[PDB]
Design a protein around this ligand. Structure first.
Ligand SMILES: Nc1ncnc2c1ncn2[C@@H]1O/C(=C/[C@@H](N)CC[C@H](N)C(=O)O)[C@@H](O)[C@H]1O
Ligand SMILES: Nc1ncnc2c1ncn2[C@@H]1O/C(=C/[C@@H](N)CC[C@H](N)C(=O)O)[C@@H](O)[C@H]1O
Lengths: 307, 303, 318, 8, 8, 318, 8
């Protein structure tokens, strides 16, 4: 019933990792296509002339596996909106390189972060790749409900956290997404990978995402609570958000390390299955309308036409 | 020497210990397998030749950073999200895993042992900073002070509760774990490297993503110089009574600076990114650099 | 894309033919007595994921000759596969070059240049332009594999295909552009109206100064049936080396070779042809420094418009 | 369904 | 296949 | 066309400025004592029908200096006018070259290269790419006239112009392509919303290896009125030599110079701007080996789509 | 004029 993926930033052996992940019950793996620490130079000598293979071979997996089991991830050092001209230029070239490799591999989806207000140049480079060749792949913009700056621990003496309500301010990450997709002119290949935090924001921040193309929901292991038996569970408010996301048929992504160490890893995914099974059964109307959700139809005209 | 047949291309770290033996950290950042390795060379001039090491070991994932823990312990910042502790056997012929604790949710980028040698600090792409108890193999405290990746963490040379951290959120934080709110923000371009002054308790240097090196004194204005054309990867003070400051960059160069940050030595020996520098404790004018070009270079610095 | 190269590699016939052509060339260039001293410099120009590099090494082993290989590839994604093959298997014997063959400053001259830059209409993937630019690094007595290729055309009738092209009208372009472009198609429900005739030929190395890859051909096809003309089927033949060839021309089709389906050049308006009439077609190969294209017209029994003038509907990027 | 026709 | 792409 | 060059030539200010710039350069390069021995090699790069050749000769006469001239022109039609001028008037002092300056194998190096390859947005006629290719034949201490140029942008309001662009919808193209291309227009019924700010700068000769003529600029315009944003007016300034300049920027407009009208970059959807708000615009100069184009977007007070991505509606041919 | 062509 529930389609779920594993998010990793460390894949020492591609074949061994995929096997371990499939055994755990996951349907897909979000992983780096180039080593996340392998910063590359395109303009200055001698580093621009770095030899050897720039990454792992496409021969490591079958075409079917690349097409169905792997979601690419943009390298964390790629900063197209950097204040430094040199980083901006190397990042544009690296972003185009990584997106082109993803398309070369036939990846079903590719993850890109929205982790600051200004992603103008990231949108420009993405729009340019979209208007270049094969138009099938999906781009999942990784955006949090609550920005890291707004959920940081109140531990900086000379920089206290804001304890005042900032109605529009707490909705900031939606404006990051909105501006990005406006720039990319509402491409249908650009969707949201919504990242959920340990503490949920006010309902108005959550509802801001209603009507948005959410294709995935990212659940860090650190947001999970522990029950009397020692197994990962979620707060009632988190469960309420999972139920809403299940109606949108999002793919769930489990990120981070095992924090329930003496309770195995598939337990996180077993809990999502539990929530999925323990939901209200659809009524006569809901069972009838299944398949027609957001399906645009021409209104019948029984006068002008013979039904 | 009962070690891996070949070390990975990308040399990440190099550290001399008191007797002058050289510890190397390496990862394969490309090809089929993305793992790492740890090596000890009692003869540093033979490095990186595998058949001439004293000890070598394969790690499960890449080595993003490492540090000595006394004379026989090795603390590793792994790609796996784990902080690892390895230990040289009594014969110093084997490197044995003591602990592998997966506490971070992304790559552990930086590691630093505190004054006592019983505790350490780790920084990660997961935005958290953790304080570890090395004997009990546990995280004592976990701090989410930053708003982006933690770039560098550096323990005070002589104060066990004091450390520095910097990040892509454009903050340099001075920590003092004796305080209820333990971090304090120190007052352009992203900070990328940190080094405490080995003699002046409240003085430190910092490198940034634009090639600038800056001198800062906790009290107060800052002295600075455009040393590199790209990111300042590392900053390491020499062992002399009046130390020299080695700076290394993604621009593939090494610079050795004085007290006023003026250049005294420059090397273009590396053909790829310069990753670590370590000064010999035996001959104070010899500085060893390692890079992604797989070179271990021994520089004779004019002192 | 990776899977495109994977489809290419599934053809066993093509590569075994290349191997046989390299094998014979090596024997003709190095006498038995020079076996251990003479190292032939072989360049695979457009190496993809490495099958012609492997074909060259198998060829050198079976010929019992020494080779020095360069694998040149402009696609950086395929260069990843090549560099992983080079480290893991090939070694120092193979030098992988990530470059366009037209720009590469070769460090040595070649004895043999091996390439497979052929389309369904032979020169439609721009093999002449690519090998012309690479020519300067081939030795004076050097061999190019392929040595030659020829395209062929044949008039066809297919109201089924005519309607299939007709339905390719897209928004924001000329409403008739779909008729001014070729299609790769496994022709099935159709009638071939006259025997395929040769259209354009290219030879490598090209020893006619300033080359001129532009061409103009008039073909006269006898038709023995009452029919309707809807387009021209295109095929090709290639001489890899001497008697070692590849062909998709129906009459000489290489058995079991499926790398290329025929090409189809449609016409905008169907043409009635009576038994005993002649179909006269005109084909041009045109270019500027940026693009190459084809233009075509029927002049007998009736004239058609010239199709694709100035490459307005279809061009092949240089 | 629901008083509509067409779509895909 | 057969040196072609796209279609449907 | 002939009449286009004839319109260029009607501007008295432009050429008298070029003459003054060449005159000063000749005096700075040849001391009085070297007057009769030192022959300066002057190359007019993109000579059209010969006005800069005549401007160079007038400049050399008034400076009382010796010049050796080359008039380089890629347009063969203009080359007819130049060759007729060379035979009838100029003589041996002028060598007419029918070539692209990027391909010409110059037989001698130049002391001064003179060109007028400027558009209404300075670099929009591809002066950087042209002078970059010609750079190798300029001596180590050589001077390029112009030495520098800078484009400027200013936000504008004009529902009149917005409707004028709107009516440029054509068949067989994207229905919104007219908004993704610049227009040369003598702006009249409009409101300039903020002071022009510099966008892109180019310097000749270019001493930043591998050049990189691609650019990315963010501009923040303070707006003191309630208005509606419809596009950006583009202008330029150029340093011919030292203090000798040309400008179409309204505030520093060269008096009586009509060679260039401003350029207009429209936006697809009008943007409401309140008094005290900031208009933030982003402009990119992009290229491949075949074309150069601009891409632009508004990010404050509201985001617009990125206009002309990958040059889909507008490109400048190389 | 003014570096432009076409229009009407
Ligand atoms: N000018 C060029 N320089 C280098 N490679 C090129 C050039 N033009 C095309 N190619 C490459 O050569 C290629 C050839 C293919 N038609 C065949 C691929 C491969 N040899 C195979 O038979 O499996 C593609 O990989 C292109 O990327
Ligand atoms: N790469 C090039 N090589 C030679 N001429 C060029 C090139 N690009 C443009 N031109 C020519 O130089 C020209 C310049 C014009 N913008 C100005 C014409 C002339 N100098 C005048 O001021 O009246 C046109 O005549 C173009 O044909």
């Amino acid at each position: 019933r529930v389609s779920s993926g594993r998010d990793l930033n460390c894949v020492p052996e591609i074949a061994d990792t995929l096997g371990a992940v499939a055994k755990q019950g996951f349907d897909f793996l979000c992983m780096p296509v180039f080593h996340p620490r392998f910063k590359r130079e395109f303009i200055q000598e001698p580093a621009k002339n770095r030899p050897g293979p720039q990454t792992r071979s496409d021969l490591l997996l079958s075409g079917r596996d690349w097409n169905t089991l792997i979601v690419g991830k943009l390298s964390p050092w790629i900063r197209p909106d950097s204040k430094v001209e040199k980083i901006r230029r190397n990042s544009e070239a690296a972003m185009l390189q990584e997106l082109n490799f993803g398309a070369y591999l036939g990846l079903p989806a590719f993850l890109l972060p929205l982790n600051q207000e200004d992603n103008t140049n990231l949108a420009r480079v993405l729009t340019n790749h979209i208007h270049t060749g094969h138009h099938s792949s999906m781009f999942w913009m990784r955006v949090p409900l609550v920005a890291p700056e707004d959920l940081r621990d109140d531990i900086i003496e000379n920089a206290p956290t804001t304890h005042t309500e900032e109605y529009s301010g707490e909705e900031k990450t939606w404006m990051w997404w909105h501006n990005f997709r406006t720039l990319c002119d509402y491409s249908k290949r650009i969707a949201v990978a919504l990242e959920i935090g340990a503490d949920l924001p006010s309902n108005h921040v959550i509802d801001r995402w209603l009507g948005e193309p959410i294709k995935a929901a990212i659940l860090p292991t650190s947001i999970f609570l522990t029950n009397k038996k020692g197994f990962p569970v979620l707060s009632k408010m988190h469960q309420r958000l999972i139920f809403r996301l299940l109606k949108l048929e999002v793919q769930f992504i489990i990120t981070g390390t095992n924090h329930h160490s003496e309770k195995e890893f598939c337990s996180y995914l077993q809990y999502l299955e539990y929530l999925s099974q323990n939901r209200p059964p659809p009524n006569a109307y809901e069972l009838f309308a299944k398949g027609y959700e957001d399906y645009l139809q021409s209104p019948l005209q029984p006068l002008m036409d013979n039904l | 020497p009962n070690a891996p047949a070949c070390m990975e291309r990308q040399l990440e770290a190099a550290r001399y210990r008191s007797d002058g033996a050289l510890l190397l950290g390496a990862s394969s950042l490309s090809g089929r397998c993305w793992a790492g390795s740890l090596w000890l060379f009692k003869d540093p001039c033979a490095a990186p030749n595998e058949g001439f090491c004293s000890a070598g070991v394969q790690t499960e994932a890449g080595v993003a950073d490492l540090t000595w823990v006394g004379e026989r312990g090795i603390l590793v910042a792994s790609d796996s999200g784990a902080v690892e502790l390895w230990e040289l056997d009594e014969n110093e012929t084997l490197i044995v895993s003591k602990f592998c604790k997966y506490e971070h949710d992304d790559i552990v980028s930086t590691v630093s042992v505190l004054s006592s040698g019983t505790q350490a600090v780790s920084g990660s792409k997961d935005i958290c900073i953790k304080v570890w108890d090395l004997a009990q193999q546990v995280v004592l405290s976990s701090y989410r002070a930053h708003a982006a990746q933690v770039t560098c963490v550096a323990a005070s040379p002589h104060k066990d509760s004091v450390f520095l951290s910097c990040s892509e959120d454009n903050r340099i934080l001075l920590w003092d774990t004796r305080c209820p709110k333990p971090a304090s923000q120190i007052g352009g371009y992203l900070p990328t490297s940190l080094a405490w002054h080995p003699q002046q308790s409240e003085v430190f240097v910092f490198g940034d993503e634009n090639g600038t090196v800056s001198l800062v004194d906790t009290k107060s204005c800052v002295l600075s110089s455009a040393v590199h054309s790209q990111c300042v990867t590392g900053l390491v003070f020499s062992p002399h009574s009046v130390p020299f400051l080695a700076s290394l960059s993604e621009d593939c160069s090494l610079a050795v600076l004085d007290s006023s940050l003026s250049e005294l030595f420059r090397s273009q020996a590396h053909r790829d990114f310069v990753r670590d520098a370590t000064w010999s404790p035996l001959n104070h004018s010899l500085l060893t650099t390692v890079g992604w070009d797989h070179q271990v270079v021994h520089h004779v610095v004019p002192t | 894309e990776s899977q495109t190269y994977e489809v290419f590699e599934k053809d066993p016939i093509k590569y075994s033919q290349y191997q046989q052509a390299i094998y014979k060339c090596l024997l003709d260039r190095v006498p038995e007595e020079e076996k251990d001293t003479n190292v032939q410099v072989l360049m695979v120009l457009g190496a993809g994921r490495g099958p012609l590099v492997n074909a060259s090494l198998r060829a050198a082993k079976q010929a019992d000759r020494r080779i020095k290989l360069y694998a040149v590839e402009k696609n950086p994604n395929a260069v990843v596969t090549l560099e992983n093959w080079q480290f893991e298997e090939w070694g120092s014997q193979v030098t992988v070059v990530s470059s366009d063959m037209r720009e590469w400053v070769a460090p040595e001259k070649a004895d043999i240049i091996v390439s497979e830059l052929l389309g369904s209409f032979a020169d439609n993937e721009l093999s002449p332009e690519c090998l012309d630019g690479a020519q300067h690094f081939l030795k004076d007595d050097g061999v190019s594999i392929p040595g030659e290729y020829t395209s062929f055309l044949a008039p066809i009738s297919s109201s089924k295909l005519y309607n299939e092209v007709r339905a390719c009208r897209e928004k924001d372009r000329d409403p008739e552009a779909q008729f001014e472009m070729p299609y790769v198609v496994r022709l099935h429900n159709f009638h071939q109206l006259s025997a395929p005739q040769p259209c354009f030929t290219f030879s490598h190395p090209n020893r006619d100064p300033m080359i001129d890859n532009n061409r103009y051909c008039t073909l006269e096809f006898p038709v023995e049936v009452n029919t309707v003309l809807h387009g021209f089927a295109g095929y090709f033949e290639t001489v890899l080396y001497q008697d070692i060839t590849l062909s998709i021309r129906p009459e000489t089709h290489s058995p079991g070779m499926f790398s290329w389906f025929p090409i189809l050049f449609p016409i905008k308006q169907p043409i009635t042809v009576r038994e005993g009439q002649t179909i006269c077609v005109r084909f041009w190969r045109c270019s500027n420094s940026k693009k190459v294209w084809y233009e075509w017209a029927v002049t007998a029994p009736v004239c058609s418009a010239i199709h694709n003038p100035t490459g307005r509907s279809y061009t092949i990027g240089l | 369904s629901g008083r509509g026709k067409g779509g895909k």
